[PDB]
Amino acid sequence: QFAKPEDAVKYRQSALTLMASHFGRMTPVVKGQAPYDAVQIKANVEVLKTLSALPWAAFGPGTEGGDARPEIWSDAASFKQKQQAFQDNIVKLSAAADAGDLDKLRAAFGDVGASCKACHDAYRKK
Amino acid sequence: QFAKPEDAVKYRQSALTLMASHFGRMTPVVKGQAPYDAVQIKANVEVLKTLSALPWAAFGPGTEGGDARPEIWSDAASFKQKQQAFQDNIVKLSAAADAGDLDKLRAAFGDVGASCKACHDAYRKK
Ligand code: HEC
Ligand code: HEC
């Protein structure tokens, strides 16, 4: 759906921005600094699920640009494992949210955050 | 979820960018320049449904900025009608896509596009 690599870059940066917001807005809840409303969190994590599937198709071949490292494309299988593992970390968060289980939500939230970092440390430029 | 108005601006611009892509990528399909795969379009319109609910909460009071016109905030009811009407235009597109009805998809796609414009002409700066 991208006319130029710049369009893929703009899309993925937008998608990732929306993920940072839907993930990060739960930090006060997991820390107990804001109240835990199970219905609210379930709905927010469903948005995050949808968004978390979107960036990867905007790293197609030849879409070097932005802050993406070239290693994304020299080993396609490894990058794919990264994004699939991340999306499965999101599945754990979804399951926690759907169960209304604050303790599982905390644990899954931490693991999701680690997975964001695991990808950045291999694949995102400084 | 926004520390500063600039964060709300960045969020809504990102959300609207993702809408332009999930809407606009169907143009070749509705024109017949690309094949119509009902399953594919159903899934894409579900993404567009999710995204099309997101921008509006990032125009909270005091979040002037970007290319948003001030009229968004001097008549809250009128802006709300705009975004609600748009989301109901998206409902028609969802119903068409879920039915696998290409003729209804074409018609709804045109009406959605008109609704994007109706809002821009009142509420988006040049
Ligand atoms: C690899 C599988 C990634 C995972 C998992 C996550 N992110 Fe990431 N992110 C990745 C890359 C390669 C890039 C650079 C994209 C480019 O072309 O520039 C990024 C970028 C971001 C950004 C900045 C977006 C922007 O506005 O330019 C943010 C805010 C971001 N990423 C956040 C983020 C969070 C919170 C994640 C887990 C919930 C996450 N990313 C996962 C690669 C990958
Ligand atoms: C009002 C109810 C709107 C509807 C419906 C749509 N859009 Fe719009 N859009 C609106 C505003 C007020 C703004 C400016 C936001 C800001 O603070 O700058 C926009 C902006 C866009 C953009 C640019 C985003 C960016 O990267 O800065 C795009 C690409 C865009 N809008 C597309 C778009 C499409 C395709 C729509 C219908 C499917 C649509 N918008 C509806 C207000 C409103």
Q: Quick one: how many helices (H) and strands (E) in chain A?
A: 6, 0
Q: A99 vs A24, A39, A74, B75, CA distance in Å?
A: 20, 10, 40, 40
Ligand 2 centroid distance, CA of A112 (Å): 30
> Would you say the C-alpha torsion B108, B112, B117, B119 has a positive or negative sign?
positive
Q: A92 vs A31, A87, A100, B8, CA distance in Å?
A: 18, 9, 12, 28
- HSE at residue A74, side-chain half, CA atoms within 13 A, is 6
* Distance spanning both ends of chain A, measured CA to CA: 28
The C-alpha atoms of residue A116 and residue A16 are separated, in whole angstroms, by: 10
All residues of chain B having their beta carbon less than 8 Å from the beta carbon of residue A33 are none
Identify how the structure was determined.
X-ray
CA angle B19, B20, B22 (to 5 degrees): 60
Asked if A21 has any chain B CB less than 8 Å from its own CB, the reply is yes
Question: In this structure, which ligand is nearest to the CA of B123?
Answer: 2
- Nearest CB to A17 within list B10, B47, B50: B10
Question: Which residues 48-67 in chain A show a CB within 8 A of chain B?
Answer: 50, 54
Residue tagged 């839907």 (tokens): A22
B83 Cβ contact partners less than 8 Å away, ≥ 6 residues apart: B55, B56, B119
According to CATH, the topology of domain B2-126 is Four Helix Bundle (Hemerythrin (Met), subunit A) (1.20.120)
The C-alpha atoms of residue A52 and residue A108 are separated, in whole angstroms, by: 15
**Rounded (to 5) percent helix, strand, coil in chain A:** 75, 0, 25
Binary contact (B14, A11; C-beta < 8 A): no
Instruction: Please name the helix (run of DSSP H) or strand (run of DSSP E) that holds residue B66, with its range, or none.
Output: none
Q: Which two tokens stand for residue B104?
A: 């209804």
Question: Which residues 29-48 in chain B show a CB within 8 A of chain A?
Answer: 47
The C-alpha atoms of residue A46 and residue A97 are separated, in whole angstroms, by: 9
In one letter, which amino acid is A2?
F
